Amino acid sequence: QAFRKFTKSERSKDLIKEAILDNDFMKNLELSQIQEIVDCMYPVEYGKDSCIIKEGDVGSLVYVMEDGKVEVTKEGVKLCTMGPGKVFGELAILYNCTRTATVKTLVNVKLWAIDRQCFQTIMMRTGLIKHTEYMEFLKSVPTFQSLPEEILSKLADVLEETHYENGEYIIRQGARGDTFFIISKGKVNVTREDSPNEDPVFLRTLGKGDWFGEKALQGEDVRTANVIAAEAVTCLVIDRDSFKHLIGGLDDVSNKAYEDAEAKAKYEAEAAFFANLK
């Protein structure tokens, strides 16, 4: 399914969009999401001296002022007035829907609104978009393309995107590591120092699609070589424990697979029975 779009003027569309990009909470949303919210919102008007949001209320609507002026007050304390181009009523959505302040109108106003559902949903599409971009990325790299679909997709739901600047060491020869890295952007150099005062030896170079620190996923072990960024570098990463988890979460028994075990079992039970006798 999908949501009911309310076709509006480009003027209003642009306005709604600026107000969002100007809101502490929503300025982070992905374009696709912002355009969605922009299309979901419908017009709402309130007369002068009308209470729109009352603190304590359990609310669902998020608004965008288009015209008029409102006044925000909390526990009786006037906080500010707001005019066109401002978002309000978005905060309750991340406090279990309990309004944190009162919003009364000073003149007749014209708002653009969206309900809790269209809102909470749209917001939710954040993890989905990530998974997509990640999946898209993983499937562009030969090695990870070959991986079965269950892990590849479950890997994409927990991976974190950490960053590095030219010159920073990502991992060092001799450290107690537990993080696996997949280069999504940049390039790095791997070096290892022979043993004593032997200047660091250059081993290989990795870049987009390459990876390193695999061993950390297979129990406690010290790194065999250093890995330093050789320019701006981005890495999708996952720590050992989280991995062990992902793996121990591959709840995917195949139809025929359960059948074969369904068989293996019977055989054993019978043989086990006769065993117990003589």
Q: Does 274 bind a copy of itself (CB under 8 A)?
A: yes
Q: Does 144 bind a copy of itself (CB under 8 A)?
A: yes
Query: Which residue's CB is nearer to a copy of itself, number 9 or number 276?
Result: 276
Among the listed residues 79, 107, 222, 232, the single contact to ligand CMP using CB under 6 A = 79
For the beta carbon of residue 15, count every other beta carbon within 10 angstroms.
20
Beta bridge partners of 82: 70
In contact, 105 and 65? CB cutoff 8 Å: no
Q: Does 205 bind a copy of itself (CB under 8 A)?
A: no
Q: Which of the ranges 20-28, 126-134, 157-165, 265-273 carries the binding residues for a copy of itself, by CB under 8 A?
A: 265-273
Among the listed residues 27, 48, 78, 244, the single contact to a copy of itself using CB under 8 A = 244
Q: Does 100 bind ligand CMP (CB under 6 A)?
A: yes
Q: Which of the ranges 38-46, 87-95, 142-150, 154-162 carries the binding residues for ligand CMP, by CB under 6 A?
A: 87-95
| Chain center to CA of 234 | 16
CB of 263 to a copy of itself, least distance (A): 8
Q: Two tokens at 134?
A: 């990640």
CA distance 273 to 30: 63
Q: Of ligand CMP, a copy of itself, none, which one does residue 92 interact with (CB within 5 to 8 Å by kind)?
A: ligand CMP
Annotate 88-113 with b (16+ C-beta within 10 A) or e (fewer): bbbbbbeeeeebebbbbbeeebebbb
Q: Does 140 bind a copy of itself (CB under 8 A)?
A: no
Q: Of ligand CMP, a copy of itself, none, which one does residue 148 interact with (CB within 5 to 8 Å by kind)?
A: a copy of itself
- Enumerate the known binding-site residues for 3',5'-cyclic AMP: 89-92, 99-100
x-or-dash pattern for ligand CMP, window 39-78, by CB under 6 A? --------------x-----x------------x-x----
Which residues contact a copy of itself by CB under 8 A?
Answer: 143-144, 146-148, 150-151, 211, 214, 217-218, 244, 247-248, 250-254, 256-258, 260-262, 264-266, 269-270, 272-274, 276-278
